Amino acid sequence: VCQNAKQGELKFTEYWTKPYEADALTTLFVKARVAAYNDVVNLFPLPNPKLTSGPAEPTSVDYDALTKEAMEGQKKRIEAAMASV
């Protein structure tokens, strides 16, 4: 009974006020999602959208290199986690 997803975890979904009606897959997914959020050392920055009509800002950070290193980090983290279990 207490393995149901919490309302905050199911926020903005159809099961926000009725977490007892969510699927087992959905409850497990959101319970893993909340844990994923609490690992900002490996959480991805999710770059800003390009909404302004002007040219793209040159910035100083390469999103491609960050995405590649995040792919590597995700692969290694998944490998280590599966080794643990």
Partner: protein, 215 residues
């Protein structure tokens, strides 16, 4: 058990953490305390040759793991650091209490009484600058030797080991440093008792029957 996140204080599987200073890595302290106490300098003949710690103040850091799994109470290493610092400060304070009454150095207001010199130097335009310089120098020599991590028993330095040894001590093959440390600790406790006696005499005259005429 409980997941990796959501682990705080009393939750099962929560490793104890110690990170008070913003900018320093998290340190995970083991209980220790009693183990360090069993092999700790002090405990001379005056109390029977055993480590005189009634009230069990050195065991409270071990009891932190039982109370809330938080470093509320100091490690015995922090207790020795505090004892050493108090002893040195009280040695200097006793010598200052009995030297200010007879000597005067700077442009500070003439106040032989020790209980008023601090305030009168606060009020002095040419005393506030000097006390500010004293304060910044003390802060430098205190933050450089921050210890602090001794609160959880991992200081990486023996207690009272500031970067100060102009003489050949701690380096000569002779001059066993254990005896020197014991002398420092016991003279520090003696100076703290002396400062307490000075305060008692200042507040309750005739308490110590040797400083009756003292300030």
């Amino acid at each position: 058990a409980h997941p990796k996140h959501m682990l705080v204080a009393g939750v099962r599987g929560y490793e104890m953490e110690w990170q008070p200073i913003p900018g320093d890595a998290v340190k995970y302290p083991k209980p220790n305390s009693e183990e360090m106490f069993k092999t700790m300098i002090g405990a001379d003949v005056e109390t029977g040759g055993e480590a005189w710690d009634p009230l069990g103040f050195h065991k409270l850091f071990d009891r932190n793991f039982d109370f809330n799994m938080l470093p509320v109470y100091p490690h015995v290493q922090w207790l020795r650091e505090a004892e050493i610092k108090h002893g040195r400060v009280c040695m200097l304070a006793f010598i200052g209490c009995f030297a200010q009454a007879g000597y005067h150095i700077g442009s500070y207001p003439v106040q032989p009484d020790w209980s008023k010199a601090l305030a009168e130097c606060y009020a002095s335009p040419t005393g506030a600058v000097g006390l500010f310089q004293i304060s910044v120098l003390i802060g430098w020599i205190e933050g450089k030797n921050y210890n602090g991590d001794a609160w959880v028993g991992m200081s990486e330095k023996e207690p009272g080991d500031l970067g100060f040894d102009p003489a050949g001590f701690t380096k000569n093959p002779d001059f066993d440093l254990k005896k020197a440390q014991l002398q420092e600790i016991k003279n520090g406790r003696l100076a703290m008792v002396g400062c307490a006696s000075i305060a008692a005499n200042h507040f309750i005259p005739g308490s110590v029957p040797l400083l009756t005429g003292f300030y």
